[PDB]
């Protein structure tokens, strides 16, 4: 209907102006910019994009600004945008005037690839800075001052491919969804970068939606079936344990706690947030039993439970690198949920979370005024949480409008 197009646009246009008013009321710092790329760069909306913050932040005491560069994925080239935020956030008309007028120059470009996922690693052993995983399952290691990658893993061009690196940055895991069993590809990233350490096909699963490492010798895998398959670095064809959750919908992704080797975060299409301990799943034992898909949900009671906004399918989660209670959640429509389980740890200290408890646990909800439209580009990797800057996150929409901000939780630390 023609009114239906004037329906959703008009409602959001007021709702955006609603969130536009409380912008100075709910955040400590919020900024937006349009990426300015040189000639030849693809500016399409369906352009596959990703962003992740770098660790080479800069201080500016003479101007009170904090420089935070970010690596921007635009097709085959990687752009670098230095975000200007206030210095009072952790420890600006002209600072914005530069980046908006600075033509983004592609520092690293991988011709023949589509940037799907990237991981900035500070590894002085290989002297590398960024390792981007192409849409064709390919990865390329580029060092400082190098326009072309120094090492790459090139697969024959034909989907979904996810890449996760070990805690010591020595082992790389790569998924290859083949249209043919899904494969989890192991690549050593210490001395022999680019060579496959192993190949373990997962029979009966077509795609691996997410890859996440639990430790330096333990890894996990997630298929479309929502069954968590954790495979070990040891010499074993099958997973040592299998985690199956069908109570709160089909599982979408997972996250590993940086301080709790046993406690992890789970997500499902049903909008429920689950926190589970690895020792309990392994306590079941004997994953070598017949893989009865017909068997009901495993009787595994998780540690704690939460819910997203209106049961929104949680597509991504990442625990903070500075705080063990601050959690990042990604909804289906791009909204960034701010979760801080500090209240649950108190109710667990005096003795299911109540509706008021889950109401108190959410720090904030960043929808960007409904401007984060649901395009064809998956916004899973289009969100970057600062590992060294508290509550500072960056987002990339299909409109190219790059967003970086820090929310105000109101709790004076």
């Amino acid at each position: 209907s023609t009114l239906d197009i004037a329906e959703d646009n008009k409602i959001k246009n007021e709702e955006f102006k609603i969130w536009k008013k409380s912008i100075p009321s709910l955040y400590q710092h919020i900024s937006s910019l349009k990426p300015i790329f040189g000639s030849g760069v693809d500016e399409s909306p369906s352009t596959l994009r990703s962003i992740v913050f770098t660790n080479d932040s800069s201080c500016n005491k003479s101007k009170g600004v904090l420089s935070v560069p970010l690596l921007y994925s635009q097709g085959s080239e990687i752009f670098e945008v230095d975000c200007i935020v206030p210095l009072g956030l952790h420890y600006y008309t002209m600072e914005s005037q530069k980046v908006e007028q600075t033509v983004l120059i592609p520092k690293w470009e991988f011709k023949g690839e589509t940037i799907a996922k990237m991981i900035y690693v500070d590894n002085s052993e290989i002297n590398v800075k960024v390792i981007a995983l192409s849409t064709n399952g390919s990865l390329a290691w580029f060092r400082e001052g190098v326009k072309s990658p120094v090492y790459t893993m090139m697969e024959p061009s034909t989907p979904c491919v996810d890449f996760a690196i070990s805690n010591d940055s020595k082992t790389l895991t790569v998924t290859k969804e083949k249209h043919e069993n899904a494969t989890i590809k192991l690549i050593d990233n210490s001395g022999k970068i680019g060579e496959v350490l192993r190949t373990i096909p997962v029979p009966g699963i077509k795609n691996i939606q997410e890859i996440k490492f639990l430790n330096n010798q333990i890894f996990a895998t997630c298929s479309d079936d929502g069954i968590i398959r954790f495979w070990g670095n040891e010499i074993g064809k099958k997973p040592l344990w299998i985690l199956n959750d069908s109570l709160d919908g089909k599982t979408t992704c997972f996250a590993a706690s940086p301080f709790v080797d046993t406690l992890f975060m789970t997500g499902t299409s049903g909008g429920a947030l689950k926190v589970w301990d690895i020792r309990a799943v392994i306590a079941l034992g004997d994953a070598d039993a017949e893989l009865n898909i017909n068997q009901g949900h495993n009787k595994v009671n998780e540690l704690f439970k939460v819910h997203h906004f209106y049961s929104e399918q949680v597509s991504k989660i990442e625990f903070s690198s500075i705080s063990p209670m601050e959690v990042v959640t990604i909804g289906g429509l791009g909204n960034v949920y701010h979760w801080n389980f500090e209240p649950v740890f108190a109710i667990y200290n005096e003795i299911i979370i109540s509706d008021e408890l889950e109401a108190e646990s959410m720090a904030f909800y960043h929808t960007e005024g409904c401007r984060r439209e649901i395009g064809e580009n998956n916004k899973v990797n289009t969100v970057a949480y600062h590992k060294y800057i508290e509550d500072l996150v960056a987002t990339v929409d299909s409109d190219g409008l790059l967003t970086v901000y820090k929310p105000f939780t109101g709790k004076v630390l």
Binding site: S1, E7, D8, K12, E15, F309, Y310
Partner: peptide, 16 residues
């Protein structure tokens, strides 16, 4: 009370 691109504006109303 319950109802009495067309579904798009409908899904937005339930959330608010």
């Amino acid at each position: 009370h319950p109802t009495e691109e067309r579904l798009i504006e409908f899904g937005q109303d339930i959330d608010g």
